[PDB]
Paper text:
Longer polyamines are produced by aminopropyltransferases (APTs), enzymes that catalyze the transfer of an aminopropyl group from decarboxylated S-adenosylmethionine (dc-SAM), a universal cofactor of APTs, to a polyamine substrate. Thus, spermidine synthase (SPDS) utilizes PUT as the substrate for spermidine (SPD) biosynthesis. AtSPDS1 and AtSPDS2 share the fold of polyamine biosynthesis proteins with the characteristic two-domain topology. The active site of AtSPDS is formed between the N-terminal and C-terminal domains.
Author numbering:
A (entry chain A): 37 to 299, 303 to 330
B (entry chain B): 40 to 297, 304 to 331
């Protein structure tokens, strides 16, 4: 315990210049798949204590043990803030748990999903079968392709909500954090329609987040809000979300119209009406920058 | 000299099996074995100075504000005009600095059993150990379990238990007799705030503490949590309890606080801290 020379065997360490000088490590019981698509390095492993894990370019995308915090917040923060959402786009794929979360909403008629990397969808469907059932809902339209693009095929004003479940800005998601993409989402949303994006750590990425929020305040003339939640296996143990609405009926992201936990899937594991409001209560160092 | 990344510090414990937060080490500043525990201080590359006790991260300069502001302001902003407070558990004096932010306070007793924690924190974290210099502080080097047993019944407005984990010297601080001793020491409507671990890692431990507190404390019993990146799972929680007496609403601060501005705590995040995820709320509010 003295000098850090003896490496204990059997660990995956998540190291990146996006979180310099630190790493989250998980003990690996077995590698289920490891390969390299046209887009990124793809790992599925069985961890000792977080269940199965998807890793892309050495970055943890999800674990079975805590994906409920991310998947339920990214989905229910937007969808519980608008009445009777019917048509939803999800940009970015995975184990389908976000599709299952969208499908909890009885009003939903069409769930479009765009994921560039068919490799990630294929191995996710095979190794997370209990959650990849989300792909089998008859409302789901899965497109393998670029999200930036898919939107250009998209009818103006046709979506109630767009959920951007992206990887980090280093990799295939790079342009999903930039202005043209956000302009493209705004066009696709109805008046008063909402976007919810993966918006990184207030502990690690304040400069990046400042630029996201600035870009959003300029494009989205309705509400622009930033929420955060606990996800142990994302860097610093938190991740945030941009919530924005376009010009049109007013949206109050902080007080949900229709909280999904209030009323097939199990009970919500994480989301409830009170933690929906709590997610907008940022620490003082952040609240002063973001607001 | 075990780590999972050559040259890095990795926090490994059976209290969080199968995971480790690792920090790159610029230089080891101190290594020692007290009468109670192994003590390390190191300059991390990106989190400033880090205090480690028995291989467990106790604080880092970069995020200690989240823990030190919530553990002090949650209890003290929930009661009117607190005057006399007890801190159990030593550190860099950051908790003392946050208690001192309250003008109403007249007396801050602190009891830390391990002289080496205090000495190391004063030597290596001097910019924050100015907490110990406020003239209201009464630093006792002593067993805090003993100190509460010998405390005058009804004499404290608040007790803050800023402890290490249940494996090591702090073991008894998590058990029912210690909690009964705290209830005895608090005035009617007096409050306790204890370090109460991770809802993601420790639900069985937290369920038992909650159950013990409901048995002992007939005022309010509530659990709060906050973000601290360098505690395992990225969160830590607190037991807030008040004794029978004047009502205490821990969720809405009756005594909101205004030398640097608060970095983390504010009135809105005070209430937010009590909004637990559905899996926990169900167990804790049972």
């Amino acid at each position: 315990p003295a000098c850090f020379s003896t490496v204990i065997p059997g660990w995956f360490s998540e190291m990146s210049p996006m979180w310099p000088g630190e790493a989250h490590s998980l003990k690996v019981e077995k590698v289920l798949f490891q390969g390299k698509s046209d887009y990124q390095d793809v790992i599925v492993f069985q961890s000792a204590t977080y269940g199965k894990v998807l890793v892309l370019d050495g970055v943890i995308q999800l674990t079975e043990r805590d994906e409920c915090a991310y998947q339920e917040m990214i989905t229910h923060l937007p969808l519980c803030s608008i009445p009777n959402p019917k048509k939803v786009l999800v940009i970015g794929g995975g184990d389908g748990g976000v599709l299952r979360e969208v499908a909890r909403h009885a009003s939903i008629e069409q769930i479009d999903m765009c994921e560039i990397d068919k490799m990630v969808v294929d191995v996710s469907k095979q190794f997370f079968p209990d959650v990849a059932i989300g792909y089998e809902d008859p409302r789901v339209n899965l497109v393998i392709g670029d999200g930036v693009a898919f939107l250009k095929n998209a009818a103006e004003g046709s979506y109630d909500a767009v959920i951007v479940d992206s990887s980090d800005p280093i990799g295939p998601a790079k342009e999903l954090f930039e202005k043209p993409f956000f302009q493209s989402v705004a066009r696709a949303l109805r008046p008063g329609g909402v976007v919810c994006t993966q918006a990184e750590s207030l502990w690690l990425h304040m400069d990046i987040i400042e630029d996201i929020v600035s870009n959003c305040r300029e494009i989205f003339k309705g509400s622009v809000n930033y929420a955060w939640t606990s996800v142990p296996t994302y860097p610093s143990g938190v991740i945030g979300f941009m919530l924005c609405s376009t010009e049109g009926p007013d949206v109050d992201f902080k007080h949900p119209l229709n909280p999904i936990d209030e009323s097939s899937n199990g009970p919500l594991k994480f989301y409830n009406a009170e933690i929906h409001s709590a997610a907008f209560c940022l620490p003082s160092f952040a609240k002063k920058v973001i607001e």
